[PDB]
Structure formats: C-alpha cells, structure tokens
Amino acid sequence: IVEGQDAEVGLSPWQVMLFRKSPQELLCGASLISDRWVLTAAHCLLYPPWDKNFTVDDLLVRIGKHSRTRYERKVEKISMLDKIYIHPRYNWKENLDRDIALLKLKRPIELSDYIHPVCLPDKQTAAKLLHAGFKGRVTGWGNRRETWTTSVAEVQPSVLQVVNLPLVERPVCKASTRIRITDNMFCAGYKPGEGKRGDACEGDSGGPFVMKSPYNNRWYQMGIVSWGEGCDRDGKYGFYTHVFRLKKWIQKVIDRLGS
Amino acid sequence: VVYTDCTESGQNLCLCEGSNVXGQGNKCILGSDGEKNQXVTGEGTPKPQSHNDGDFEEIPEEYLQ
Amino acid sequence: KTFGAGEADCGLRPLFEKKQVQDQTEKELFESYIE
Numbered sequence: 391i392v393e394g395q396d397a398e399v400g401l402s403p404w405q406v407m408l409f410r411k412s413p414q415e416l417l418c419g420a421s422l423i424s425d426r427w428v429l430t431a432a433h434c435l436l437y438p439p440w441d442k443n444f445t446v447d448d449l450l451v452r453i454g455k456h457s458r459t460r461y462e463r464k465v466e467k468i469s470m471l472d473k474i475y476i477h478p479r480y481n482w483k484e485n486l487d488r489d490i491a492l493l494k495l496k497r498p499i500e501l502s503d504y505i506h507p508v509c510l511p512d513k514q515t516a517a518k519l520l521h522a523g524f525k526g527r528v529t530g531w532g533n534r535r536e537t538w539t540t541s542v543a544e545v546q547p548s549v550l551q552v553v554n555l556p557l558v559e560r561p562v563c564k565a566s567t568r569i570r571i572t573d574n575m576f577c578a579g580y581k582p583g584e585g586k587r588g589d590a591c592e593g594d595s596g597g598p599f600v601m602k603s604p605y606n607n608r609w610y611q612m613g614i615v616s617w618g619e620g621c622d623r624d625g626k627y628g629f630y631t632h633v634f635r636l637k638k639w640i641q642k643v644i645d646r647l648g649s
Numbered sequence: 650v651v652y653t654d655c656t657e658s659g660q661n662l663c664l665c666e667g668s669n670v671x672g673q674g675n676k677c678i679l680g681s682d683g684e685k686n687q688x689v690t691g692e693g694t695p696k697p698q699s700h701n702d703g704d705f706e707e708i709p710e711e712y713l714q
Numbered sequence: 715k716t717f718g719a720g721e722a723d724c725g726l727r728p729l730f731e732k733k734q735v736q737d738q739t740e741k742e743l744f745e746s747y748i749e
C-alpha cells in the first residue's frame with residue numbers, strides 16, 4: 391500500500407495473507423468470506439509468465455494477522471488449503487480478465503475479534519455503492535513504494551496498511567491505459583492534482599477492495615486487487631476484479647455438491 | 650501484478666514506453682543515454698518477479714511437514 | 715451447508731460495529747457518498 395497508514399488492530403478481520411511454505415514469504419493478499427472459504431486473485435495462484443502454478447501443498451493462509459513478519463500466536467490462525475478453484479475463463483493474456491480464485495480451507499476456523507468474514511455484494515449493493523467518486527478501502531502487506539534505492543526490504547511495512555481510494559469513471563479508466571479494460575474490471579485512485587495520493591503495490595494483489603454500506607452498516611468486497619502500471623503514478627489507476635460481476639461463478643463453486 | 654520498469658532489453662510484461670506495459674508478443678529495447686525505450690514486436694522474457702522477501706518469525710513445524 | 719457459517723453476520727467487525735465504535739477513517743468513506 392502506497393501512501394497508506396498502519397491499520398488499527400481488528401480493522402480488516404477478513405484480511406488473509408497467502409504464504410509460500412518453502413521459502414517462507416508473503417505471496418498475495420486474500421479475503422475471508424466464510425468460516426471455510428477464502429477469495430483471492432487467480433494470478434496469485436496461476437501465472438505462467440513467472441512459471442507459477444501452485445498446488446495446495448505449496449501454500450498456507452494466515453488470518454487475524456496485524457504484523458507482517460511476527461508469528462502472532464494468541465491471535466492469528468494458520469490454515470492449509472483443501473482445494474484451489476480458478477475461474478475457468480481466466481485469461482492471463484491481455485491482463486487478467488476474470489482475475490478471481492477461491493481457496494477452500496482444509497478446516498473451518500473459529501471467528502474472533504481478529505477473524506471475521508466480509509460480505510459479498512448483491513445487485514442492490516452494487517447499484518448503490520458503485521459510483522464514480524465513492525471511496526472504498528484497500529489493505530495489504532505490500533510495498534510502500536514502487537521502487538527503492540537499496541533493497542525491497544526498505545519499502546516493506548511492519549504492520550498491515552490501509553488506504554481509502556475513490557472509484558473512477560470507466561471512460562477515465564479506459565483513457566488512462568492502452569490495455570483493453572473489460573466489464574470484469576474497474577479502476578480506483580486519485581486524479582492528478584486531486585491533492586491526495588495512494589495505491590496498491592507489489593504484494594497487495596489478491597487483497598480486497600471493500601466499501602461500507604450506509605444502509606446496513608456492513609462491509610462488502612466490491613473488488614480484488616488485480617493489476618497496475620506502476621504504483622501511485624500520476625494519470626494511472628489501480629485495476630480491480632469486479633467481484634459482483636463474477637458472483638455467479640462464486641456461487642456455482644460454493645454451492646457445488648463436492649464442496 | 651504490478652508492471653514496473655523493464656530493467657534489461659528483451660524483457661516484456663514491464664513498463665517500457667513511459668507508463669505502458671510492453672505486452673506478450675513484444676519486447677523492450679532499452680534506450681541508453683538520451684534514447685527513448687521502444688516496445689517492439691518480438692519474443693520477450695517476462696521481467697522476473699521481485700521476491701516479497703522477508704524476515705518472518707518461524708511458525709510451528711507442523712505447518713510444513 | 716457447503717458455504718459454512720458466516721453469511722448472516724458478515725461485514726460486521728467485532729472491534730468496531732459490534733461495539734458501536736467507528737474506525738479512524740471510515741468517516742472519510744461516508745463523506746465521499748455525501749459530498
């Protein structure tokens with residue numbers, strides 16, 4: 391998160407860190423949507439250009455984490471994965487159409503002060519909340535800057551970062567980049583000389599873009615951090631998977647008999 | 650994924666011309682001194698991912714073996 | 715039940731909404747809806 395702040399304890403209890411077993415390292419953000427199901431971006435799991443194709447044996451998820459590096463024993467839960475589900479029409483050519491994946495936890499977790507699912511939007515939610523200029527919120531453990539002088543270590547946060555960013559009009563999103571933008575994406579961020587800044591950056595992807603409903607006081611994940619050209623560059627915007635538009639596939643997977 | 654600046658010629662899936670990704674069937678000719686970069690048709694190598702590298706405290710051994 | 719528990723109580727944080735407490739920056743989000 392570029393230009394964000396230390397999140398208060400318990401700010402984002404649905405926040406999940408996806409973790410490689412060997413070497414131990416942070417891979418991506420993710421979110422908790424039930425006691426048993428975790429949402430993330432497809433590209434966190436499958437990305438041929440980096441020869442990346444994880445199996446369940448490769449990964450752990452960590453939940454209720456506040457620190458980036460500490461092991462927080464009385465507080466965080468580490469879980470193995472039972473199954474990976476990548477959207478069947480995920481097109482990692484042309485920047486990541488349908489950049490969505492579900493991970494089923496090997497075991498259902500107890501909820502706590504620090505662990506709690508986010509709501510997924512329905513039709514009304516999307517209609518009410520998705521308007522240019524309405525602000526959502528992005529959280530993650532990724533880089534605090536796009537580049538560094540000496541080492542990546544220098545831009546890494548000690549604690550979960552948060553930033554609030556406005557939805558941007560589709561035409562403005564399309565005009566900001568030469569990549570083809572689909573209906574499965576949206577962009578957010580400040581325009582140059584709005585006089586505020588902020589963005590997701592490396593290590594935040596797969597993490598959630600949430601909005602709070604005024605109507606029911608509940609948090610909803612409208613987005614998954616998907617892609618960007620740099621972090622926090624003027625005239626550029628973060629792109630996010632449109633969760634509501636892909637909800638039918640989410641429902642299909644979860645309602646399936648097997649899991 | 651964040652596309653960041655191409656760091657050697659031949660790379661793709663990185664920012665080549667200004668703030669624009671140089672995509673798959675293309676590669677990035679790096680300008681040196683006073684030269685612009687060019688994204689050209691050709692086979693490129695993806696710029697390697699930066700390892701999200703840390704000093705993690707060790708978690709129980711049970712979560713590996 | 716293949717979804718699991720959590721849908722009915724989703725989006726309500728134990729340290730915030732459950733306690734009728736606001737986080738430090740949520741006000742900003744609501745300001746964006748209003749003005």
Ligand SMILES: *[C@@H]1O[C@H](CO)[C@@H](O)[C@H](O)[C@H]1NC(C)=O
Nearest residue numbers: 436437438442443444445446
């Ligand atoms: C991804 O995963 C499975 C092995 O788990 C394999 O059969 C498949 O071909 C892999 N490669 C790609 C590019 O999907």
Ligand code: NA
Nearest residue numbers: 579622623626
């Ligand atoms: Na920007």
